[PDB]
Amino acid sequence: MDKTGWITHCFGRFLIDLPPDAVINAGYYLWGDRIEYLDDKPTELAARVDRLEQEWRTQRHKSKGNMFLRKIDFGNESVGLLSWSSEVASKTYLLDTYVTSKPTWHVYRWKGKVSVDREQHAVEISRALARNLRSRAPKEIPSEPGFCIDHAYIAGDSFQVERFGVGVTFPEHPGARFEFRSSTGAELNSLLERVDGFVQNMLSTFAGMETLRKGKHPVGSLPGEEYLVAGSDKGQRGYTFMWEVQGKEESLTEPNLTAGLAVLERSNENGKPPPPAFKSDKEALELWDTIVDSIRVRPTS
Template sequence: MKPDWKTHAIGRHLVDVPASAQLVETWKYHKDPIELLTPGDNTQFGQLVSQREAQLKAQVQRSGKTSFVERALLLNGSVALVSWYRPYNESDYALETYFRAGKEILRSPGAVTVGKKEKALEFLKRCSDKWREIPDGQIPEGIGFVVGNTILADNIPTYESWHLLIQLAGKPDVTFQVSGFVGAADEGLRKRAGGILASMLGMAAGLSQLRNHARPVGPIQADEILVAGNQNGKRGYGFKWEAPGKDYSLAEPNLNVSLQVRESAYATNRESFSSDDEALELWDTVVNSIRLRAGAV
């Protein structure tokens, strides 16, 4: 790994990023979003859940009953709050789950039909027993889906996804994103690339194609399309790398990396890249680093 870079764990994968970059992450597990809340002890956790429960009890359905249905106790102190999903309809429940992982607190909102509530609570109970806190500065080991400083130590086949926005220091004009989700693209990137070379930069002319080829990374089969163009004296970029993935595979999800420099408030490339070589070096370093974390599945 290059000096002044670090390895970052997200989902079941690892990616190397500049240590100076700010990272913005989002995650979904079993199709429901996961939020990392402010860490806290048992007292703070209890206050958080009780406050939310009181809010739900204060809400009233069109039928006149309270929106709150029940507090379901899970494992390791985790809790699911069950309420009516809509004020005018009582066919679906909202499930708002608060998980504990050491001092970390996670929230996951979801919904389920009335008839599937018990099955959903059993799944949440399973999850609540498998959340673990990751010690600061450590790359987690073993089976699991990484969310910030926590890991859900399970490999049950389900839909999971993650998204990483890499905000580069001193380069506010660059949008750099890496993402993964369980599922497969119908076709590879290059097969469905009709029109993409123009649309990636939002230009109809002035584009040059830097690369358009198969771009495997280790065992990951993928395609790469890189384009660049000049407009009003500014160099723009539209880079994309994609591994199509396999359906239902935690080990081989659909993986995407994209980098863009488009029109903005900046009239020059001072806030992006001084040359194509600089852009390509950064791109290649990140893309070449993507790998499945050992033992993650």
């Protein structure tokens, strides 16, 4: 396939190539909670944080008094607001952390629950985050080890729970969506064994369903397996392409990895069969293979 103009993107520990007109929405998660990129300028961020602290200070726990516990200084201008996680909570706090990349300033919000008896540990994690958050240009590929997010990367190669999910649409293929995810930890079962029952059920029930492909699909040293199905009903064609690397425990570069491409049911435009996502199964498989075969761990030093 002609990848003229395709763009190599960094997501987490990985790289992937997408067409230049791809519409991309990404999310990044640390220890299970989203690290959200904020548009805030520094004065705006300060006002945002002060505003929230003062809101919390007006709120009351049902028995323990003030909902606001403390503002924590994580060093490197990063701060956290610590509050009870609810008005009846006794074992968990909400820790709302704000952190900036260096040396180019960008602001992030990373909020999640923390155990009362794990407070010091949570603090050290945020301290470390503030030390490790390095800025990068939107398409800059870091040669240093680390987990890439919007406008930055978390430098280092020490294990942490980390995950991303990226969703992609294609102007030329209405109704199609591609998604790419990584998550630390081995998935509990493997893709082919997991879905085969349901797929066989689909094939048996619906004459319009077919399996296009089922088996191994390694991409470099990534031991991926795939299951690709398509079907027709109501004069439109649907697709579900599934690819997975099971993952290894406590591994940043061998996490669980999934890639998927779907075309779900869409509607007729004023009583006319919806516009086709693809010209043919061959075209869909081509796009699928081209994207998946571009997935690789970001080379680092």
